[PDB]
Structures are given as structure tokens and as C-alpha cells.
Amino acid sequence: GPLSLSVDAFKILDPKWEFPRKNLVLGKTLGEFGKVVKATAFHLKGRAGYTTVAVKMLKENASPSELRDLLSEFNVLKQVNHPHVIKLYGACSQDGPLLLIVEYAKYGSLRGFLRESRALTMGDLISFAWQISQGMQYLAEMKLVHRDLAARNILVAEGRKMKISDFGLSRDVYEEDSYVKRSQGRIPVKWMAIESLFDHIYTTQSDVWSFGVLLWEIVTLGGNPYPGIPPERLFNLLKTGHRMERPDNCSEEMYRLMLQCWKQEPDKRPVFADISKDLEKMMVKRR
Amino acid sequence: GPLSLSVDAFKIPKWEFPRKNLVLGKTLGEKVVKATAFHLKGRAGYTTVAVKMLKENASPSELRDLLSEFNVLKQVNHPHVIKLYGACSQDGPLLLIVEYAKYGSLRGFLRESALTMGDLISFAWQISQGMQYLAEMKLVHRDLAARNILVAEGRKMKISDFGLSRDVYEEDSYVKRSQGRIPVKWMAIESLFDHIYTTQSDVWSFGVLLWEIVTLGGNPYPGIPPERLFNLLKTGHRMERPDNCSEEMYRLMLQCWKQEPDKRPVFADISKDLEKMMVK
């Protein structure tokens, strides 16, 4: 099938991205559709000596789905280049499990980083969202729907820099401007757009919806969306037009922007350039 | 879509159990928790049970798997299949209340070990017998592996995890267009390449499970990466005879792993082959 073809095609292939396994040394697990370990790499793409990196790999007992997502992630990361998108340095595929060598983000996930804090200003939180918005605009212009946008999938690198991560679920939408998934998806339901939940339709405008949930996650310093509401209740709660109330410590302008990200009709939502301009307008009231 | 239709249907019997009579305890595994249930189906007082629920941040796919498990468990009834007692959905999160298995998973239980080859064969036989029942009901399990078998009181095997199970009454096969969620190292060659699932692919998996049993919870195809399996299988390679395995036992595993599904033994014949080993 599609995967057997992709495995054979891949194993018979770019010396641009291949990295000798023997120059790579793995350490502790950072997190667990894959696993990530901290690692160190010798003579990595013209960097002399060792460079600290993260390494994405398959878990124990990988299904075909998981293998496919690793291969797809690899494929998206090759095409992609933005200060707010995680950087790929190479891959080991030749005599051992498939390993993707990627940018180490010293603070871990944005969720984790938010949860560890209190000291952060609204200005810091706005800058974070703005950085993410710029990365999303560049992926959107590259014709890619990310699908899985969430605090847990955004890394915080050196300097408190946002890095969009986890491209397993990203799809190319050059031709049709939407990605349609027949069977049930694997994005948490509390981050999915209404048309994704009901019609299995994913577009840049469902990324915007997700971005709205992510704003909520930022403003709450890593809260759990729809707290105490079971995922199965979401269908009915969304079509009957309910949305999350304004959280504390959230300004009127911000909340207004989350709601617009959550408009029932996709075409009525802001595109990522409007989101960035909107976030600038708030940043201007603080800096 | 299919899920929203199902969720509404489900929301709109003798399986409902009041939430306030159920007390959750420690996590047993990832989601399943130890729990206790007051006045569960005519049992007076408190009964120790397990409770299956949705993990944090469940995707539609996982929601559907939970609803599916519930729907299959309503229909199924055999000494070696985990038993469903009820469910809570009225308010709060969807919870399925199921038989508690005091020794946990068969993998964990094998790995903590003194057991005879007689004990090992009996384990396989009990599962084979449960598979036989499930095959008769026209159900393809798909996800059979030591981590999905439970060890209840008296060292009784309980087949578990029906999330991925599928009805094959009409067509006798289950064909999944997209990529499955069963680990590659337990999938039949036809499931790997053509996405085809039958009772004969369950037999292949049962073969892998025999291997797990005999090695006391060994990891299949050790030090071989999942992606190499495609090629290794199509070119005819199979796991070598493990240490401490009879000739007859191994012979049974290879026959489970025949390239052609119709050349593989049927569950009924495996229960016989194992009972013969039992007796000899």
C-alpha cells in the first residue's frame, strides 16, 4: 500500500539530510505520536565539534500510522524554513531505527513553560502569540495546514523564542485549499474547528480556530480548554453555538480576537496576517 | 459526520450504572483505573472493578474507539473475554466498568517471572478458545498481543481491548483504507501491505503472541526497526526458534505466519494442537 511504497522509495534515496549514526549520541527522554530524546551531534552540517540537538524517533511498537507520520514530518521539515518553525538538521535512516535530528528548545513546550510561571507580562504573552502567528502565516503561504496547533506543540527555544513543532499531521493543500480526512482524525477534539469535528474538513481557517484555542492556553498560562467538559459534549455545545467564557487576566481585545477565531463560518474568521496586526495593536498599548 | 451521528444516538438500558455509586482509585495503565462499585448488577455492597475512560485530550478517533469497545462488549460473553458490567454517560465523562484482573497484563505478568511450559501452553489455549468464540461471532480482533491480554483471579486469561475490533459478518474481511494503529510487529503481511484484516490475520497475531508467551514477554523481532519488516516479511523471513521452545510449539508459530492466509491453521485447530501439547 501507500506506506510500503513510501518505505521502499525512502530507503532507496538525499545526502543533503543523511547524518552518520556514529556521530550521534543519545541522552535522556524529553517527551512522548513520537518520542524525543536530548542528543549531541558531532560535526553536524558544518558546525565544528558537538551541538546539542533533539532527536525525534518512533516509540516502542510503532503502528503503520506512526511510521507514516514520522516520514511525513521528515518530508515537511525539509521544505520549511522560518525563525518560528523548528529546524531540521538531518536524519539517520541507514542501519538502525529512523531518527530525525532537530533543533533543541531549551525551555521545552510552551505549555510546560506557561505552567511553570506566574514572571511574565501580558506583553510577553502577546509576543509569544505574535511569533506563532508569523510562523502560521508562512506555513499558510507554503500551502500547508498544520492541523495540530496547541501549546503542547509549540516549543520555547533559547531567548524565549517560539518554535512551531510536530508536523506529523500537516497536509499539503496546494491544489484544493482543503484537506479532507475520511476516517476519524487524531487531533484532540477540544482544539478542532467545528467543520473539522463534523465534516472532517481542514483548512487554514481551521488552523485559525486552533490558534484561538491556543490564545486561550496562552492567556490562562496553560489552562485546560473547556475545563470539566467531556470531549463528547463538544459536538452539541459547538453547533448550539457555545464558546469558552472570557478567562481571568484576559483583556477585552484579546478575548474579542479568540471569539473571532471561533466564528462558525470559516470565511468569517481572521487570516493569520489580521491576527498578527491585531496582536501588534495590543502590543502597542503595552510597549 | 459518523461520530457526531453516533454520539447523538448514544446519548438519545441495563448497562447504565449511576455515577455516584462508583469510586475511582489509582491508575492501572494508559486509560484504565482501579475502582469500586456499589450495588453493581445485583451484587450487594462493593465490588472491585476496572474503569476504562478517555485520556486527557482525546481525539475523535479515541472517542470512536471507546464507543466501539462498549458496543462490542455489550455483545460478547465468554470465560476468557473480559466482562463488561456497565457504563456511566448520563453526566461527566464516559466510563466503562469492566472486570478487574488482579495480575494485570499478560506481558507484565510474564516479565515478572516460576512457571512451567504447562502453565504457558494453558495460557495460549485459554486465549485460543476465546479467539475461537470471537471468530464464531464473526469478530476480527486485530490487536491481539500479550499487553492486551489480562491475567485475572486463578491466573485466568482475559482477552481485552476491543477498541479496534471489527464486525465481519457480511464480507468476512475488514479493509482499512488509511493506516492502522496496530503495531507493525503484530500485523499479518496482508494487513501490512494490503490493509486486509480477517480471522486469519488474528491467527498471525496469535502466532506473535505465542512467541511472547514462550519468551516470557520478549520483544518481537528484537533490534529490528518496524520499517524493515515490510521487506523482511515479503522476502520470507520469520523469527527464529526462541530458547526453551518445543519443536511442536515453534512449528505452530510458523504455521501461524504462513504467507498465505488460507494455509494458516484456524482457531479451532490451534485449541486442538495446544490441548494435544497439554496432554503430551
Ligand SMILES: Cc1cc(C)c(/C=C2\C(=O)Nc3ccccc32)[nH]1
Ligand atoms: C528541554 C525540552 C523539553 C522538551 C519536551 C523538549 C522537546 C523538544 C526539543 O527540545 N526539540 C524538539 C523538536 C521537536 C519536538 C520536541 C522537541 N525539549
Ligand SMILES: Cc1cc(C)c(/C=C2\C(=O)Nc3ccccc32)[nH]1
Ligand atoms: C491490576 C491491574 C493492572 C492492570 C494494568 C490492570 C488492567 C485491567 C484490569 O484489571 N481490568 C481491565 C479491563 C480492561 C483493560 C485493562 C484492565 N489491572
